[PDB]
Write a protein that binds this ligand. Structure first.
Ligand SMILES: [Fe+3]
Ligand SMILES: [Fe+3]
Ligand SMILES: [Mn+2]
Ligand SMILES: [Mn+2]
Lengths: 334, 327
């Protein structure tokens, strides 16, 4: 399309004042943007957000496409230990509802206050991916003949799962309040803490420990169907986390006055609390070791990724621990 | 039988009470029961819509625009033919966002059911794809994107439609809005009629016809093919909307007063008038295969079909002048 503009190829305006509402690119903002029309996608300002959207759209998969026959045979055999089963069941219990918590938070809390069409475009992709992930866990329950009411209620029945999710509810903050606003320093700091709570802590910390447990099974040729689905989930979660980081940093950069010593320290403490709860959860999963996994490795690993998340939002590492699972940064071609 | 250790043991031997009773679940106003837990699924129609939507994955960038680009830049299309294309792109480019934003900002909060929400997530993402489609068309054809996207502020017949949409949206966005009263739930249902029945069910279908008529003549087939994928999505959106409205009615028969029914009929009547006005702005003279008078019949025909689906009497009794749109 480098050819001449043909005559008659523009549409005539019959509202002479309408032109003024065309969106100026440099007037667009991540939050508190009421000066321009939020319904028009164009012109795109946040290329990073649009890129995340395009990348996510290229990652389409469904749980129902992954064969579970071998997982079914292994699950029904005596070849899995009781301790191996416990790891699997606790993870399916935590994940089955965690995805709904992330998904509902995108819609009910985040979307409204991210006043930018290209970022909202990503958010709708992300929320849909959370639906696919919830579907995954129903598909696993039904494939393996598990009691799905038992699995989905896990966060009310297992203390270490509940403590993680109650912590999540607390960091959700006042954002769900219908009268909550981001057009003050306090409001915007509150909103960023929600973003840290969901992108950095829930998706960036609480999930990864489960990923290691399940992908370890996969590495050992056990439950490769569940493992393959978690691989697709991890591919999604990586983008989710990167968008969150970009959103947080962009908001900081556009509103530098919210990023105070006090807020920074508050964020570190929430992350510290999250690390402890994740370690406690890992201890509940592994009271005894399974092949290549024990609770003590998760002390180092959870602290390690916590450091990586901290750096990405401009805060200093605080644990300085080794990563006992370097294979988690392997490229998987799906 | 099942192997030993296939169950998680509770250490909150008290949390089992929070398991969801299937028959406790409701479409709206359901805060007795844990809305985060998907299972047990009560509304199978909603889950079915979700699965069907997921099998329909497409991306506008999968569809070659080479032949469309060549045709757009040549002298082969008349000024009148270009006019139909530009106005439709103008309307659709932002209307998809209006629908997508309403799902999230209005509908999701008040549909207190996980399987129905699951579908809403799919629908909202589908609207994001549709929006991407219009950006892709603009970039491909070298159109002034700000001119196309701002069309609903620049063209009277388009603005009239979206001003009407804003009115029928109601107070649903208001922080003080609630559905736990007859009046509240009636207003919520009117928003559902406004978006599923009117916007998606009438305004969009009329535009489908205009673009797909080009496709039928082998003109702008890249755009046409994208619209076929959009229509495929839109069929399910409408089907879900109709199920949701009827489901809410059945569970809350007190809202479906003679007064509400008549209110809804008047809203559909106005929508019909506005779409006919829009069709006449699109086709002041009429191009090959398209005259404004055919849209008088078509808009009325589909409005009748939508009325029947939500238990209202058809009022126009006009025939379908585009039998192919059925196929
Ligand atoms: Fe995620
Ligand atoms: Fe739609
Ligand atoms: Mn997820
Ligand atoms: Mn649409």
């Amino acid at each position: 399309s480098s050819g001449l503009v043909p005559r008659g190829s523009h549409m005539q305006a019959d509202i002479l004042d309408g032109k003024q509402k065309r969106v100026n690119l440099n007037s667009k903002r991540l939050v508190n943007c009421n000066q321009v029309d939020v319904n028009q996608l164009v012109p795109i300002k946040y290329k990073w957000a649009w890129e995340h959207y395009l990348n996510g759209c290229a990652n389409n998969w469904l749980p129902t496409e992954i064969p579970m026959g071998k997982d079914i045979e292994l699950w029904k055999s005596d070849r899995l230990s009781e301790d191996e089963r416990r790891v699997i069941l606790l993870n399916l219990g935590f994940f089955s509802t965690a995805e709904s918590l992330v998904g509902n938070n995108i819609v009910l809390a985040i979307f409204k206050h991210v006043t930018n069409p290209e970022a909202r475009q990503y958010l709708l992709r992300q929320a849909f991916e959370e639906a696919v992930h919830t579907h995954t866990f129903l598909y696993i329950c039904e494939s393996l003949g598990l009691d799905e009411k038992e699995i989905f209620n896990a966060y009310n029945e297992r203390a270490a799962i509940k403590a993680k999710d109650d912590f999540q509810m607390e960091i959700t903050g006042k954002v769900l309040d219908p009268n909550f606003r981001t057009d003050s320093v306090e409001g915007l700091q509150e909103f960023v803490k929600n973003l840290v709570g969901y992108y950095i802590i829930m998706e960036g910390i609480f999930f990864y420990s489960g990923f290691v447990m399940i992908l370890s099974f996969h590495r050992q040729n056990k439950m490769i169907g569940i493992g393959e689905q978690y691989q697709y989930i991890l591919r999604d979660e990586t983008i989710h986390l990167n968008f969150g980081i970009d959103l947080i940093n962009g908001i900081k950069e556009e509103n530098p006055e919210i990023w105070t010593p006090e807020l920074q320290q508050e964020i570190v403490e929430l992350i510290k609390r999250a690390v402890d709860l994740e370690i406690e959860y890992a201890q509940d999963c592994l009271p005894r070791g399974i092949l290549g996994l024990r609770a003590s490795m998760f002390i180092d690993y959870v602290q390690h990724i916590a450091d990586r998340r901290l750096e990405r939002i401009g805060l200093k590492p605080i644990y300085h621990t080794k990563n006992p699972f370097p294979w988690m940064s392997e490229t998987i071609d799906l």
